[PDB]
Symmetry: none
Subunit: 27 residues, 3 copies
């Protein structure tokens, strides 16, 4: 058999920004 | 040599979105 | 000998919505 597999890779990049929040209420 | 290890997990959550729009007058 | 580290993972989840907007 081969050498062992290498270690697990690192976490990926940050996710994308979220959407805008809800609109504010009417004045 | 062995193979590459498994892929890593997903990264951190993304940043929050921007504030929502102002409400109507 | 061991293999190399695996690749970096996927991009993370999307972030949460932003805060509510201001009153008009």
């Amino acid at each position: 058999p081969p050498g062992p597999p290498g270690p697990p890779g690192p976490p990926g990049p940050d996710g994308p920004p979220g959407p805008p929040g809800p609109p504010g209420p009417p004045g």
